[PDB]
Amino acid sequence: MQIFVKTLTGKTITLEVEPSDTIENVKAKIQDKEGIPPDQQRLIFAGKQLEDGRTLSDYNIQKESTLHLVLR
Ligand SMILES: [Hg+2]
């Protein structure tokens, strides 16, 4: 499914992911696509900071959802 990642620069990146994917993989996808080191990625959804060991499904993130990316 497709999801959006809104960065603080005003750029929104599109990503193809599965609800079963882990947050660490999502960060991996972002680094692969935008080159942002995973260690600097702070993802937020619904006011919650996402944890590397959890999955998108754990947070109820569905298609067309928008995550927020703040660089650490
Ligand atoms: Hg938002």
Side-chain angles (χ1 to χ4, degrees), residues 6 44-46 66-68:
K6 184 172 176 56
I44 302 175
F45 175 73
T66 297
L67 316 193
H68 283 280

Side-chain angles (χ1 to χ4, degrees), residues 6-63:
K6 184 172 176 56
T7 75
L8 265 43
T9 69
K11 189 189 191 81
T12 299
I13 68 172
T14 183
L15 222 69
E16 175 64 19
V17 304
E18 289 307 310
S20 52
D21 292 338
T22 58
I23 298 305
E24 37 186 330
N25 179 50
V26 178
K27 290 178 179 183
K29 289 175 182 285
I30 294 180
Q31 180 292 139
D32 171 68
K33 178 173 183 181
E34 294 304 311
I36 303 168
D39 191 64
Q40 302 176 187
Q41 292 181 44
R42 180 183 160 219
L43 296 169
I44 302 175
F45 175 73
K48 290 186 282 281
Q49 178 178 156
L50 309 184
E51 197 176 7
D52 294 6
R54 306 290 64 186
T55 67
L56 294 174
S57 67
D58 285 346
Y59 297 95
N60 197 193
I61 293 179
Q62 295 168 168
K63 58 188 294 62

